Amino acid sequence: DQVQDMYYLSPMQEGMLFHAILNPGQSFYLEQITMKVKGSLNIKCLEESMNVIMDRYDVFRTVFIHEKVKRPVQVVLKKRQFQIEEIDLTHLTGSEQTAKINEYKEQDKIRGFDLTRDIPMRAAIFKKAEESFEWVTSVHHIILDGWCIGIVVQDLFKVYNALREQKPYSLPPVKPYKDYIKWLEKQDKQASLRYWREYLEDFEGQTTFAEQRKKQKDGYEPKELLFSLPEAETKAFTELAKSQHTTLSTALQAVWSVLISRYQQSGDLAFGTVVSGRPAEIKGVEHMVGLFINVVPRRVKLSEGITFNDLLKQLQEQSLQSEPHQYVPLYDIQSQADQPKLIDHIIVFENYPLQDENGFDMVDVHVFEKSNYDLNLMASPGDEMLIKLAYNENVFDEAFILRLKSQLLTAIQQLIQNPDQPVSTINI
């Protein structure tokens, strides 16, 4: 028997499987990480390590069954042999190499995975010269969300550097993903839907930045504007969040709420927020690897005279309230609102972005994921906080995105200088 265990899918996994099967070739749920290596890499040993990781993390050994079954199940296989696709490009010119690697990345996006058979993760390493490699890893988020990859990479290099130097290693114990499925089977699914319904009671709908949306035919032209919050502002922003017993993520969502209240001319608004999805009742949940994070609606109410510190408190409390119900798929929430466009942009605060020795230099790490919203506000910590506006240029002009950058920066500065004044006083 190849099967170690078999159990049901989380609601989000089930939604993901259904949409993946029905929309093949479209890059859904696919993350592609490109690592450019400069230095010595022991590929054979890297492969050995990957297979240690295969046995360490049950999600990599999981496949899915949906045919001739009453309800889909995920099956953990006792052992699965991983193999790196190693490609030697050394006999090609530099332009040939790049074309070769882009060709691979483009066909890889279309290929996706057959979730009923494949390991939902693969790796190709391209050798371009003696000490230069390009290492493309693809993964399906039904087994591992984007905020988990770092954990796995860290363990992979720990195994790798021990194996190559012939040293012993030990790794901390990790709970299996089934433990999260078991936690989910104790939750009251109807109470969680009721939570979202009541939270969203009487919320009416909103096209964000409607007067700025280009009304063109459908299509996605992905663009990005990257910028940073200067260190002194970043410091004061962080101090304010700490002093108010909240997070940088919540503080940024609060500032964004003020900006959107002005464009929408309204005090009742919504946007999507990526939440961790990790239940505190699950001892050791921070070390688990699998699909946890979710996009949920954030609804913000701005009354007359509300201050920034008021807003920080309103959002911090609702985050905590929401925590037992973060497993509900957005689709099911939107159906409880008879509003398929309840939200149309999101805010993503990523504490530990993969994109910032082992005997080599990591020259660059780039992440690709397909875009599901026409505007995405993305931020990560640092001495100067890193902010990205990722948008669909077929909808928003670059000039408008640039105005949004200067408004966000001036709104941060003004709300941290006067966090106890009505946010209606801020000049944007």
Residue numbers in the entry: 7 to 362, 370 to 441
Recite the paper's sentences.
To gain insight into how the engineered SrfA-CFA variant recognizes and processes a lipid substrate, we attempted to crystallize its C domain in complex with substrate analogs. Two unrelated, highly diffracting crystal forms of the SrfA-CFA C domain were obtained and used to solve apo structures to high resolution. Variant 10, harboring mutations W143T, Y145V and F155I, was found to be the best catalyst for rapid fatty acylation of l-Leu, giving an apparent rate constant of 38 ± 7 min−1. In the SrfA-CFA structures, all mutations are clearly visible in electron density maps and introduce more space between the middle of helix 4 and the β sheet. Introduction of the W143T, Y145V and F155I mutations causes the following three connected changes: (1) the N-terminus of helix 4 shifts inward, toward the pocket mutations, by up to 2 Å; (2) the helix’s capping residue, Trp153, swings over to interact with the base of the latch; and (3) the latch shifts to pack Leu360 into the mutated pocket. However, in this conformation, the active site is not connected to the expanded mutated pocket, mainly because of the position of Glu37 and Leu360. Nevertheless, a reasonable 10-undecynoyl-ppant-TycA* model can be made that positions the distal end of the 10-undecynoyl moiety into the expanded pocket. Although this model is consistent with the mutations improving activity, cocrystal structures will ultimately be required to corroborate the proposed binding mode. Structure-based considerations would certainly have included mutation of Glu37 to a smaller residue, as the side chain of Glu37 blocks the fatty acid pocket in all crystal structures.
